[model samples]
Target chain A: AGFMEAFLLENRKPKITTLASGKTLKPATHRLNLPAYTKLIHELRTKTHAKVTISLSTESQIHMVWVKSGLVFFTPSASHPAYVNTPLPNDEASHVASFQLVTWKDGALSILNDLSKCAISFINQCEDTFKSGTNLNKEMYNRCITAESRDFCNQMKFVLIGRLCYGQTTSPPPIQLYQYGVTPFISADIICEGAAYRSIDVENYAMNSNHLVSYAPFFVPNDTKPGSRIDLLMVNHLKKFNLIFDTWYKTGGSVMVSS
Target chain B: FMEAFLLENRKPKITTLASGKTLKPATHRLNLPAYTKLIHELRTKTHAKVTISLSTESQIHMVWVKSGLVFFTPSASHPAYVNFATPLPNDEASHVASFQLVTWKDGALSILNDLSKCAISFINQCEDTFKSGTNLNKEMYNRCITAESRDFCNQMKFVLIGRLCYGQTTSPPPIQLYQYGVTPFISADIICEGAAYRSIDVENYAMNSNHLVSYAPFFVPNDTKPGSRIDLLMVNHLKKFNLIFDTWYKTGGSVMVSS
Candidate 1:
């Protein structure tokens, strides 16, 4: 975003107040090292004496993240780290692909709900046929559960977090939380707020459910520091590890004695 | 675990026992509850029978265990399941397809070990720019890290088992408690002991990692009941929910006190 404003300041008709009223400056570009570029953006934000709208991109990839709200202003390119490709089921196939469910906009999530229901039904089927001395394959499943559908369940797994504030220009690293829940439920509102950045409704659709919520809900001043970021990451790890360790060691010991 | 032998006693062929005595028997088929069938197999061991070889289907997934010594008989389907499909980086042209790693088979396990090493290296790059003011998208990630991969860490995320002897199939579950350390590392040996009924290796991979090797290293009698199965599926929900609830409560209470 800082780069765009700088480019516009030089080329566009109206000069930026900070640029026009104050000293002329060069906008940092892909030429600058990452830290220098990050500093330049901060400088622009400070110079504007206001919240300057800017964009953030990674090396070799150019999808932009808005610096103001830190909302993604454009859909990410595949080359970007946070880019997730939402796989569409084959539409031309007659077997299960062309079902009204897979073809629709809200189809994937809807079909998943149906799959979840069928899974429950399959689990409860206690008939003698399902019970013992029987050999069953994926096709024979009462739920019409083919390997393809099972893969759908595999695709559906996800866990989500709500609004977070991140203002970093270089994207933050992925956090690894062992306790990151395995719930595949989707939170639709996460991407909808950034609908303008999306090119198609299908773009919005795939993202709202299939991909991991990679960027922050909104950007703040790249508020994280080296000490705090590492501390936070490691603190998060140590604290969680302690919880598991403490529980298992103490509780497990008790169970051992009882056994 | 006890359900196996009864079914074996009635129909198929008279088979010689490991002790050389033969019995006229009905083959055990799909006529039992998941747990019951598992128990039947364990009984074979206690009754002088027994993946110490098993198959790896999702349903009626089967395996066997003997005290201390563990081995995989050639029947398990998949060696492991990430449960979370970690997407490897080819886009659009093909469906995202991956497979399970297996028992004693030097397949995906070796590859995963290499990947794990690279992961540690990536975690340590501390350039000043990377250290500060940088935020990233999941797409921009150099590694295909996802909550799914994070869960690979989590799915492997077990503490330890105190004591469990699952010879309950009339042999009763064996209660062999190992000095099994709670290292939370993946083990390739868990499935080979019962490959007769399973298809692959990943199924054995994740559970073997998360669960502490408490018994015969192999003999837990697929001891799952429907009620228990549902409970475990939902367990992930309740466990993590409690973690969140416990956390928010404590933090909220602390802030309230300060306020």
Candidate 2:
């Protein structure tokens, strides 16, 4: 049976790749976007096979859900499942980001979003919750960035560069920063420490340099990209639709959409 | 005229990339290799319009130097000028790598060696630095990983997951402890933290552990690739090669190679 599932998250699971010359010390990497991701059901609906339907898993239960994008069939692999992730606690990440595909000129368009948590409202009161001088505030923001990095790990990484100079930092301090571990085929136009990825200037006071590795997100309003020879400025970043709903409904059993 | 150069301690440049599927990640990195680089040349003799010997700076230095893979013709970004840093840093790190090509057809071989370096040493260092609080030592490595992430931001984030341990906590330690701002596409593989991308360790380290972002090479190491399902393994893998250096020697040296 050839069955496929494509998770189309508001966020896509990224795929990084590299191309190098044999002798060249410096090889070029092109981080290909899973801006579209897919899971194929090659023989699922073949003449002798059964139809592959959409499936779903909620916070406490697993159920069948609507398939956002019709899947494209694929060949199978031996000895292992295709794109299965490791379990949690060991803190291992999974990149089988869910995606849905829609038909486009005999081809298909698939989207993927990884499992993640929404930005947690910084609990300014985490002071007593953790150890003394542990900097709960930093922990909170780090929590957000860590969550994001985990969601995108197979193809990415994040770190804290430094404190943000006043105004540049996010609402909370400890702006966790991240840069591309590998280059993407298509990239955002932002630059950090002479490189570009994502860094949050948590502490917004100029010259507020600190030893913490900053965490940053894909983009922030009014931030202009640094490189000029770049095409396709990354803009209008949105979270996975299902994720937004899941976060809301699971927590409130209802939907909430930000305007 | 075919010209050649070598890279001693090549530090790749990275860009930002977006993986959430719908935006252009500014840091969509392009990882360039250093140790295993290019050896190319300009083809003024055979081809008309005098081709470009090299495409990027990293290529000219690393690939052309050691491999003897020459380029054909001559041209430079700056008219009448071509610069390459040779006599690479002795005390500094030198990337070392080797490659062999396996064409779609059997017995079609292309082999080369790079007197350069692999970020393996550096990627490993990033993890240690972050954990040890030797921030200075980590900045470069951390930065490289960050640079690489944009390329695969949506799919995974590199984590030196294996090296980390629990109980002794110091801010969770930048996921995998890799050089945060890595440029995309190179000899090193950032530790993948996703379930789908990690290697099978003790049943794929089922339960109680972290997933790793595995290292992907710039190119396949030739069809004799180890393990099972070669073609399947080929998918998602990248191939890197400097343009073949035809510009071996002459007053106006110019050459390069690509894979």
Candidate 3:
């Protein structure tokens, strides 16, 4: 933005900080000086890129963007900024977690797409058996889920054969995958593959018309840290921070709002 | 702006590309591989941003969204890979340059508004003034515009001062600041004075709005060309794309459709 050259906006936007009590504060936009022009020119040269060029290109056109968009993006599908949240039947009893859909073309996860839903049903019996700090049972439950979920996700890979699906089971940035309508449903197996092997496979149970299977669509990791607030995940932060914006906002509306 | 993507229903559903453009092939949702783990992480990582956190103690936070320009009480606030031919208004048919506007807070050029348009009056007066490739006129016109746009942009900056009572007589993207309807008009200068510019000021008209500005906005330049299209600077291309949609597609029900 010439604004930065004429007026620096980045040096001015605000940053946010969270306090001990979990309260976040908006921080001021900080300043960053633009590098001198000489260096800018130096880097412009000596860059390598994909030989692939579209019929659309007029110039040999070298630039950072071409390198990224043409060579990088074309190679495979990759994860991108997509938000996922679950909406309950009541639309009130919902749980939301901020998770990234990791994927790439010709990779384990390549395409993450369209809305996805999964069911969550705690293994009441398994819960009764495991109790607290029962290492053996917990391990057994976690392992059981791991196998089933991996299998289910693998199957879903086939179920939606040519359709995009996102999956992250027992990986970092964990969330309950069993919840349907989660911001994204790519990770269905991970969320609902019956964590702890407590629950029975009851696909579409909410519909009463079961596409019965030995397991659910996604993997359900054993929430070994199940405490009194086992279900607090949704009732707490989600209810507060996870807001449903106007369709326009959700649809990438650019209308600047009035204060 | 309208780069081909794997449309949910298109691709002839199963039609083979005769002169087939491989740019956006019908990527299947599945057919994963081992490297997928890293690729998924990379693609997802590149596109989506996520924060990992843990609660050791009093660790929980809430986000609140309140209304109206509280515009403070506020803060504030595609296309093409190419530029398409768009005729200009009679007033600027000969114009060879353009005027681009940027809110003080829109530190990044493409964040809110967009790249500047050609100077209609200048272009109409002098055919091929800016496109005099292999001619001295090309260099001359480039310099001339670089200087003039800076002034026009600054004039609009002063327009907001109100105390100056500066009048505007420019074209899109950088026309003099004005207020329409019931709302009072405020210029960039006022905005700079009050708050937005405090963190960073709109420096000057982008030397090369889209191409040159990409690096400034925080990208490691892949191609050091004076201007590159690879950067996210597609506003102009998007503009043309929208025009096609508006007139040819006859889809101007909303700004978006036109876009």
The candidate maximizing TM-score is 2
What DockQ do the predictions score, one after another? 0.01, 0.03, 0.01
lDDT of 3 at B5: 8
- Over 4 Å off in model 2, which ranges? A1-6, A9-258, B1-119, B130-133, B136-196, B199-259
Which RMSD values do the candidates have, in order?
28.6, 22.8, 30.6
Per-residue lDDT tens digits of candidate 2, residues B1-259? 0001112223333322233233322222323232123222222223222233344333321111111222322223322124452332112211212222222122111222111122343334433433232324333342333343332221111212111211113222232222231223221222321111112112322331232222211221222443221121111111101011111111111112432
Better of 1 and 2 by TM-score: 2
How far is B137's C-alpha from truth in model 2 (Å)?
8.9
How well does each candidate superpose onto the true structure, as a TM-score? 0.18, 0.23, 0.15
- Chain A TM-score of model 1 comes to 0.19
User: Which candidate model has the greater DockQ, 2 or 3?
Assistant: 2
lDDT of 2 by residue, A1-259 (tens): 1100011122233332222333322222222111211122222222222233323222221111111122222211121123112221111221112222222222221111111111111112211222122232432322322122222222222111111111123421222122222222112211111122111112121233232222221111122433211111111111111111001111101011110
TM-score of 3: 0.15
- Candidate 3: stretches off by over 4 Å: A1-259, B1-136, B145-259
**Each candidate's fnat:** 0.00, 0.02, 0.00
Query: What DockQ does candidate 1 score?
Result: 0.01
